[PDB]
Structure 1
Amino acid sequence: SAPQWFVPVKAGDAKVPAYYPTDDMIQEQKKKLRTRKGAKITALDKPAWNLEKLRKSIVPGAILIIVAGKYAGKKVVFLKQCIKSGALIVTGPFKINGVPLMRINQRYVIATSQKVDVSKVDTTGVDVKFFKKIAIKKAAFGKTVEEDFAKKQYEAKKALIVEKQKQVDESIVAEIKKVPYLKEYMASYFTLKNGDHPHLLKF
Structure 2
Amino acid sequence: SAPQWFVPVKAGDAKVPAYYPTDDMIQEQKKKLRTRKGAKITALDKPAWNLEKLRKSIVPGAILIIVAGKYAGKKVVFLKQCIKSGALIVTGPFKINGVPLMRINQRYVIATSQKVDVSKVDTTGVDVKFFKKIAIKKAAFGKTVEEDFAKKQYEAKKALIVEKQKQVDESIVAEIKKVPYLKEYMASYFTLKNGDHPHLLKF
Inter-partner Cα distance in structure 1 for 2:118 and 2:174: 10
Deviations 1:35-85 (CA, angstroms, capped at 9, x unpaired): 000000000000000000000000000000000000000000000000000
- Which residue in the other structure is 1:142 paired with? 142
Q: What are the ranges of 5 or more consecutive residues in structure 2 without an aligned counterpart?
A: none
Inter-partner Cα distance in structure 1 for 2:145 and 2:62: 46
Deviations 1:77-126 (CA, angstroms, capped at 9, x unpaired): 00000000000000000000000000000000000000000000000000
How much identity, in percent, do the aligned residues show? 100
Inter-partner Cα distance in structure 2 for 1:84 and 1:68: 22
Per the TM alignment, residue 13 of structure 1 is displaced from its structure 2 partner at its CA by: 1.0
- The two structures, once aligned, show a CA RMSD in angstroms of 0.4
Inter-partner Cα distance in structure 2 for 1:178 and 1:87: 29
Inter-partner Cα distance in structure 2 for 1:51 and 1:88: 11
Inter-partner Cα distance in structure 1 for 2:144 and 2:4: 36
| Partner SS for 1:184 | helix
Inter-partner Cα distance in structure 2 for 1:109 and 1:176: 20
Inter-partner Cα distance in structure 2 for 1:157 and 1:56: 39
Inter-partner Cα distance in structure 1 for 2:130 and 2:145: 28
TM-score (norm 1): 1.00
Inter-partner Cα distance in structure 2 for 1:173 and 1:8: 68
Inter-partner Cα distance in structure 1 for 2:35 and 2:98: 43
Per the TM alignment, residue 157 of structure 1 is displaced from its structure 2 partner at its CA by: 0.2
